């Protein structure tokens, strides 16, 4: 049935959403603590902190960076 | 209409899915490079690397850790 697929879709999407945003939220909360940790230990800017800032700043074209202008 | 909401749901869920998994994927790919970077610089296990491993290992109850048993 038409709506049977549609409602099953929201099932799969609910599931994908719950799988997705559960990790998106958890992973992102983790990311918030790494950024300020870089400024907590910039001072001693060891290689890891040079390659993980590269990590944090892994932006590319098509991707949005906030506070763009410096 | 019944299916009109349902198909609009998959719209919103598609949108949420695309917003979600685009970040879930991007953020997680970033996370893959931090974990091995910790073992790249464990040797010199500075505070950052003690607090970001806490980050990477921010697990709790209800959350699954792979390779559980050591």
């Amino acid at each position: 049935d038409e709506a049977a697929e549609l409602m099953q879709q929201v099932k799969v999407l609910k599931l994908t959403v719950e799988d997705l945003e559960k990790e998106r939220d958890f992973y992102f909360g983790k990311l918030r603590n790494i950024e300020l940790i870089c400024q907590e230990n910039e001072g001693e800017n060891d290689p890891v902190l040079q390659r993980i800032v590269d990590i944090l700043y892994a932006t590319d074209e098509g991707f949005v960076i906030p506070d763009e202008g410096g | 209409d019944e299916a009109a909401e349902l198909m609009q749901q998959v719209k919103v869920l598609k949108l949420t899915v695309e917003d979600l998994e685009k970040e879930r994927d991007f953020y997680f790919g970033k996370l893959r490079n931090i974990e091995l970077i910790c073992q790249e610089n464990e040797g010199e296990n500075d505070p950052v690397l003690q607090r970001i491993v806490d980050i990477l290992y921010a697990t709790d109850e209800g959350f699954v850790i792979p390779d559980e048993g050591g």
Partner: peptide
């Protein structure tokens, strides 16, 4: 914390 890390715009 300093909102410079890549995002989407979204909302």
């Amino acid at each position: 914390k300093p909102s410079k890390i890549p995002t989407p715009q979204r909302k």
